[PDB]
């Protein structure tokens, strides 16, 4: 299969995701609707169930609404069984229509459907070339009060009908009892409750094993991807061990939610996207796009800076999931605003790097404030809007023009209101022109591109007042006027002759797992794949075609490797870096070091004998460690993903900038568990 096939669960860069709030999309089966005070068929009360389900989605996939738009993946509400209590929050009744108040990760939410409905959903989708992504929220169960056990369902957790435990009298310690977070620090937001949601303790073996088992059930059901909720709120080491469990079993594209506010740029966010095994929802991209096209609080130079910066900060910028709004933000379109603003933002997002996600109803110009006004029932299924048509014209380009799916991004012309950029990959180019100024045209002169000489029709066909482009020799375009609110797309595609790698997935796995390398120019006869200097050819390369290669990871030492391929003729490709070969299956272990006093700005880190611990390289040490919540300074702690059942030697160190002070004595040593978790407690050696 080619890189663009629905069967490619490892790469979403050529796809366009449509985010659906199941309950608010389409009620296809009135029989599973909740009843009484938990239900509102008119969907006037936005905190109750409106009746949307999997049957409805199946209906809209079959009647051509989604396929007509050019959507190729759908991301749906968390499918697991949620609590049944109607929660009164100071006067207002609330239900779990949203899917985020889990009670049992091994069963379905009956309001959405049965497991049979779920399987039918996967089948209907796959039959129409649409991938299915599910929301998954393992940070907590539901709202609980440890002293008012009668409140809601007391955050109760079930294992396929069997009561594991509740928030009140949690003697097993399945949850955290550290209070509620004030979001003051990253550590504070991880080990304390989010609002009143019972926080799961991932250091408890029962919880650890349970979640890893639960996700395997869904993988077996045929899902194509996972959206991980609240990743900034779970231990990073545990999450890596969780991603390893998925990748070492049945890898699927996974991306997490790490909220970023306006103008916020987080280095922790970057590190997590670069090292956890999963990518993230591109909040930096979204906040900036809103500032520029929506609220007008920044201009084109700020958009450019975000594009150049992110391309530098994220090791895999093409895996970040882009959007302009979602269920936790005001809808992009304001009731009174000019529609062209939304249309332009859509066009920009659809032709920009990364994986575009569209929140249901956007194409219908839905408006609404914060939760729950941003979650109204979709008003209609009309294919006659300009927004629907823009998506319909642009979504398909991600499949047919690799420059859009995998290309670099380059600014070719810019002012306060205008941005003209070029996407390029192999012998493929796309040039996009956007003039956010709704009142003034702009005179474009001096535009240079990589387009071959000739004339180019606007791919949008003038839908957004775009025009034809005339390119002379040297790729120099003749002067032209870019209309007020104008948006135009020009492109050129041709066969690529040299092997060019555009994507690799998964990005982290143990030896033996099969990875997918996507790109162009691979040729049709098997060549060679290199992991560092190690060559792999013949049988281990399970499939080889011009746009996709499937190969098993060789048994090399755990570590970071560059990947390169060479065609049958010996021609080598570009290098794709940052691939992590694990030392084996993983387990999450908590390391604790006592009496490690430091000076201000100086932090404690951990290093050791395996690649998962940096292999004694201080530049690769794990940390900085925590010392507020679970243990307090001068005792430090941290949850780390380490190879299961191995005997490891470790040492702690203090780092200030790049200046390091090693622990004295001999290495500490220990053997990792084969499964479940463990906690290692040692004293700092002077
Ligand atoms: O009654 C419980 C509520 O639970 C549900 O909330 C979900 C969201 O829908 C998820 O998408 C996600 O969103 C969180 C986000 O994970 C979290 O970081 C937080 O964001 C903070 C941010 O960290 C901080 O830097 C600052 O910018 O403020 C942000 C506020 O958004 O909040 C998001 C929104 O909840 O996770 C939570 C729970 O996992 C559900 O939506 C609600 O209807 C329900 O009330
Ligand atoms: O001509 C090459 C030149 O093109 C662009 O420069 C534009 C500039 O962005 C506009 O604001 C205006 O000043 O016209 C110039 C065209 O002469 C690129 O921005 C620039 O990097 C490049 O050299
Ligand atoms: O909370 C993290 C904090 O840890 C270290 O700060 C110590 C500091 O070194 C000690 O001298 C003492 O003052 O207590 C602090 C912990 O409360 C790091 O120095 C610091 O950068 C970091 O924020
Ligand atoms: O370079 C690998 C080496 O690193 C560690 O050695 C530390 C040592 O513990 C310190 O006391 C200090 O002398 O710096 C050394 C770094 O060179 C490991 O302890 C050791 O096993 C390993 O070989
Ligand atoms: Ca229903
Ligand atoms: Ca947590």
From Swiss-Prot:
Keywords: Calcium, Disulfide bond, Glycosyltransferase, Metal-binding, Secreted, Signal, Transferase
Active-site residue numbers: 229 (nucleophile), 257 (proton donor)
Amino-acid positions noted as binding substrate in the UniProt annotation, renumbered to this chain: 100-101, 140, 145-147, 193-196, 227, 232-233, 327, 371, 375
InterPro entries, per the entry: A-amylase/branching_C (IPR006048), A-amylase_C (IPR031319), Alpha_amylase (IPR006046), Carb-bd-like_fold (IPR013784), CBM20 (IPR002044), Glyco_hydro_13_cat_dom (IPR006047), Glyco_hydro_b (IPR013780), Glycoside_hydrolase_SF (IPR017853)
This protein's encoding gene: cgt
Positions of region (B): 139-202
Binding site for Ca(2+) 1: 27, 29, 32-33, 51, 53
Catalytic activity, reaction form: Cyclizes part of a (1->4)-alpha-D-glucan chain by formation of a (1->4)-alpha-D-glucosidic bond
Domain remark from Swiss-Prot or TrEMBL: May consist of two protein domains: the one in the N-terminal side cleaves the alpha-1,4-glucosidic bond in starch, and the other in the C-terminal side catalyzes other activities, including the reconstitution of an alpha-1,4-glucosidic linkage for cyclizing the maltooligosaccharide produced.
Comment on bound cofactor: Binds 3 Ca(2+) ions per subunit.
Stated consequence of mutating residue 229 to N: Reduces activity 23000-fold. Reduces activity 520000-fold
Name of the featured protein: Cyclomaltodextrin glucanotransferase
Region (A1): 1-138
Region (A2): 203-406
Consequence when changing residue 257 to Q: Reduces activity 4100-fold
Binding site for Ca(2+) 3: 315, 577
Region (C): 407-495
């Amino acid at each position: 299969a080619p890189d663009t096939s629905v069967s490619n669960k490892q790469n979403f860069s050529t796809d366009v995701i449509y985010q659906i709030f199941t309950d608010r999309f389409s009620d296809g089966n009135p029989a599973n609707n909740p009843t009484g005070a938990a239900f509102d068929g008119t969907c006037t009360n936005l905190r109750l169930y409106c009746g949307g389900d999997w049957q409805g989605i199946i209906n809209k996939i079959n009647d051509g609404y989604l396929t007509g738009m050019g959507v190729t993946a759908i991301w749906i509400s968390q499918p697991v069984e949620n609590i049944y209590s109607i929660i009164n929050y100071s006067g207002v009744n609330n239900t779990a229509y949203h899917g985020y108040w889990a009670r049992d990760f091994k069963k379905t939410n009956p309001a959405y459907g049965t497991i049979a409905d779920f399987q039918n959903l996967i089948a209907a989708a796959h039959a129409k070339n649409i991938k299915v992504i599910i929301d998954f929220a393992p940070n907590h169960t539901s709202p609980a009060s440890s002293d008012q056990p009668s409140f809601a369902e007391n955050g109760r957790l079930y294992d396929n009908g069997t009561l594991l435990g509740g928030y009140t009298n949690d003697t097993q310690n399945l949850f955290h009892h550290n209070g509620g977070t004030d979001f003051s620090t990253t550590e504070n937001g991880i080990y304390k409750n989010l609002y009143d949601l019972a926080d799961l303790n991932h250091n408890n073996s029962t919880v650890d094993v349970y979640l890893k088992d639960a996700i395997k059930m869904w993988l077996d059901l045929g899902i194509d991807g996972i959206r991980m909720d609240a990743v900034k709120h779970m231990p990073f080491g545990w999450q890596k061990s969780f991603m390893a469990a998925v990748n070492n079993y049945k890898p699927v594209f996974t991306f997490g939610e790490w909220f970023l506010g306006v103008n916020e740029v987080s280095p922790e966010n970057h590190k997590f996207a670069n090292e956890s095994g999963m990518s993230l929802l591109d909040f930096r991209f979204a906040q900036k796009v809103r500032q520029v096209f929506r609220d007008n609080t920044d201009n084109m130079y700020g958009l450019k800076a975000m594009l150049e910066g992110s391309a530098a900060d994220y090791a895999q910028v093409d895996d970040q999931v882009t959007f302009i709004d979602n269920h936790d933000m005001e809808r992009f379109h304001a009731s009174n605003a000019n529609r062209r603003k939304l249309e332009q933002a859509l066009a920009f997002t659809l032709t920009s790097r990364g994986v575009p996600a569209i929140y249901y109803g956007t194409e219908q110009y839905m408006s609404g404030g914060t939760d729950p006004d941003n979650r109204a029932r979709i008003p209609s299924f009309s294919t006659s809007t300009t927004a629907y048509q823009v998506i319909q014209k642009l979504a398909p380009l991600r499949k047919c023009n690799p420059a859009i799916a995998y290309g670099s991004t380059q600014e070719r012309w810019i002012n306060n209101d205008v941005l003209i950029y070029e996407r390029k990959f192999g012998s493929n180019v796309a040039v996009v022109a956007v003039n956010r100024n709704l009142n003034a045209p702009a005179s474009i002169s001096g535009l240079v591109t990589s387009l071959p000489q000739g004339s180019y029709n606007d791919v949008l066909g003038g839908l957004l007042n775009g025009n034809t482009l005339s390119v002379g020799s040297g790729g120099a375009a003749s002067n032209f006027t870019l209309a007020a609110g104008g948006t135009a797309v020009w492109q050129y595609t041709a066969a690529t002759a040299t092997p060019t790698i555009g994507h690799v997935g998964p990005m982290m796995a143990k030896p033996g797992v099969t990875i997918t390398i996507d790109g162009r120019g691979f040729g049709s006869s098997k060549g060679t794949v290199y992991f560092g200097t190690t060559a792999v050819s013949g049988a281990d390369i399970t499939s080889w075609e011009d746009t996709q290669i499937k190969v098993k990871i060789p048994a090399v030492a755990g570590g970071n490797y560059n990947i390169k391929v060479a065609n049958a003729a010996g021609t080598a490709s570009n290098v794709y870096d940052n691939f992590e070969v694990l030392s084996g299956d993983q387990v999450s272990v908590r390391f604790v070091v006592n009496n490690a006093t430091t000076a201000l700005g100086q932090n404690v880190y951990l290093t050791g004998s395996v690649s998962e611990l940096g292999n004694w390289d201080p530049a690769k040490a794990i940390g900085p460690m925590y010392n507020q919540v679970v243990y307090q300074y001068p005792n430090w702690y941290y949850d780390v993903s380490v190879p299961a059942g191995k005997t490891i030697e470790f040492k702690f160190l203090k780092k200030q900038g790049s200046t390091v002070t090693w622990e004295g004595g001999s290495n500490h040593t220990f053997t990792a568990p084969s499964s479940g978790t463990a906690t290692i407690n040692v004293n700092w050696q002077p």
